[PDB]
Amino acid sequence: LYFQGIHVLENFKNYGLLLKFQKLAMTIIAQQSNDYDVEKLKSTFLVLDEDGKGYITKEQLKKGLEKDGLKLPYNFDLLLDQIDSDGSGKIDYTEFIAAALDRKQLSKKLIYCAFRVFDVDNDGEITTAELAHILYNGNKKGNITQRDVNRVKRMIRDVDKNNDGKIDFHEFSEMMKL
């Protein structure tokens, strides 16, 4: 059934975009926060990434943690598959941050650091057009289509709490924190 298929596919697309949105927020925090604890995790990643690739193999991650003196869970391979959230087979910087930087540790300041990038115009509200340009252009400027805007609108609907079609700081924080 087609009609049912439509809603299924669109929900799938939404699931993926929401994952992308949170991972990009985490990456923005790692790049822009200047927070000591975050910087120290970035130092760990530097140590693990022994070839300077920007990503680490599952072997490198295991060996690197073992070199620290840790006893890994026997089920660590399943965990590594979960950390590899894009399924590429390797753990990139963004995935390492997104699993190692506990959401609980994200203070208001850290979450604001990401919020203010998505809120391009700094009015306190992330709009569909702002979010689409960050996700699809990487920056404030550039071409996006009404289909793109509609896709992002559907994703705002999952985060919005006051039915205004925009994401405020509170709403954003409730997405970032469980």
Site of interaction with Ca ion (CB under 5 A): 84, 86, 88, 119, 121, 123, 125, 160, 162, 164, 166
Does residue 41 interact with its own copies by CB under 8 A? yes
Residue 61: Cβ-neighbour burial (10 angstroms; 0-12, 13-18, 19+): buried
The only residue of 39, 50, 59, 81 in contact with its own copies, by rule CB under 8 A: 81
User: For helices 76-83 and 93-100, what crossing angle results, to 10°?
Assistant: 110
Closer to Ca ion by Cβ: residue 35 or 115: 115
59 is in an annotated binding site: no
84 is in an annotated binding site: yes
Tell me which amino acid residue 174 is: E
Phi, psi of 92 (to 5 degrees): -85, 170
Tell me which amino acid residue 103 is: R
Does residue 19 interact with its own copies by CB under 8 A? yes
What track of x and - describes contact with its own copies for positions 83 through 102 (by CB under 8 A)? Answer: xxxxxx---------xxxxx
